[PDB]
Amino acid sequence: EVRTIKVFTTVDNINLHTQVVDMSMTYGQQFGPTYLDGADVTKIKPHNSHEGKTFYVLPNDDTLRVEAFEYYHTTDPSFLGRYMSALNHTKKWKYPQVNGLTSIKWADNNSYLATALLTLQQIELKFNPPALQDAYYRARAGEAANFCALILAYCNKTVGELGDVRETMSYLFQHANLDSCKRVLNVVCDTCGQQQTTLKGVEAVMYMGTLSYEQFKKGVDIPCTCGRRATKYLVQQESPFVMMSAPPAQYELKHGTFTCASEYTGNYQSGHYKHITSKETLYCIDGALLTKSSEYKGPITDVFYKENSYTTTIKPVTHHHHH
């Protein structure tokens, strides 16, 4: 005798697909890789209690391939498996409210994700994939498991794997609407003259080499191809924030001069991230932990600043000689 139950399959947890499954065959024999709220049930046969429940599957048919792309903006074949695998862990993490923001209690080497999530709640950023829009809204309300699992999937990081905050933000920004962001730079060499460049989108809001926005406006020394040290400085900026990054180094964060920052203690193989936010005082959020101070000095790697529109008032030759 053939026994069956009705279940629903999905790739986006919105659009459902009715299935009649044979209770003598595993989900994998019938759907391929199958997950129940992150749990891998591929090798499990249907239970009575599964009737009417929704299972994630991989995009096997054309219908599912379109739904998955429209929701996630990826066609990487393993994406849904990686998201589900991560979700099985992140649904067990805790997301405490710390100083009015959703943080993450430490687990599974997740300090880089905690400071990324805290940072997002302090900068103006809109995501493009519906999956991130929906999950980020939930994360702001305090239910951040799906958002964290999506970050891991989009960044191709597994739970427990070491992550870099700058790289994680770069991926998040790649999936955000930054088309209104513009940056104009000028590079001045005594030998080679002046070279202006215009950057757009993610490249307009990220810079690697100095933590100081003020120093970037004054001028930073970089190598020129001729071998001399040229001066690079910010000509014009149109964006709601900027992110300045550098290899970790002792750095003083002054209250009221920045939005938030990330601190990395450790080395290239093992470390830990903390988050610093400048509000009525300086708050240091370390997952679930919170401390305060009037001054802060530590190995800072990333600093975020507010912006709207900036235009330099100084001529190039003045930046080259006075930075």
Positions in the binding site for Na ion (CB under 5 A): 125, 140
User: Binding of Zn ion at residue 11 (CB under 5 A)?
Assistant: no
User: Binding of Zn ion at residue 222 (CB under 5 A)?
Assistant: no
Nearer to Na ion, 129 or 316 (CB): 129
Min separation Cβ 219 and Zn ion, Å:
15
Nearer to Na ion, 84 or 125 (CB): 125
Of 165, 224, 235, 260, the one binding Zn ion (CB under 5 A) is 224
Site string for Cl ion, 65-104 (x = CB under 5 A): --------x-------------------------------
Window of 87-95, 103-111, 123-131, 199-207 that interacts with Cl ion by CB under 5 A: 123-131
Nearer to Cl ion, 7 or 123 (CB): 123
User: Binding of Cl ion at residue 126 (CB under 5 A)?
Assistant: yes
Q: Which long-range contacts (CB under 8 A, 24 or more apart) does 95-102 make?
A: 95/139, 95/142, 95/143, 95/144, 95/145, 96/288, 97/142, 98/285, 98/288, 98/290, 99/277, 99/279, 99/283, 99/285, 99/290, 101/277, 101/285, 102/139, 102/140, 102/141, 102/142, 102/144
C-beta of residue 151 within 8 angstroms of C-beta of residue 116: yes
Min separation Cβ 139 and Na ion, Å:
8
Task: Measure the CA dihedral 30/34/40/42, to 10°.
Answer: 10
DSSP 105-169: ---TT-HHHHHHHHHHTTS---BSSHHHHHHHHHHHTT--HHHHHHHHHHHT--TT----HHHHH
Min separation Cβ 225 and Zn ion, Å:
6
| CA–CA distance, 153 with 81 (Å, rounded to integer) | 9
- Which option in Na ion, Zn ion, Cl ion, none does residue 226 bind, with CB closer than 5 to 8 A by kind? Zn ion
Residues in the site for Zn ion, rule: CB under 5 A?
Answer: 189, 191-192, 224, 226, 228
Residues in the site for Cl ion, rule: CB under 5 A?
Answer: 73, 126-129, 133, 136, 175
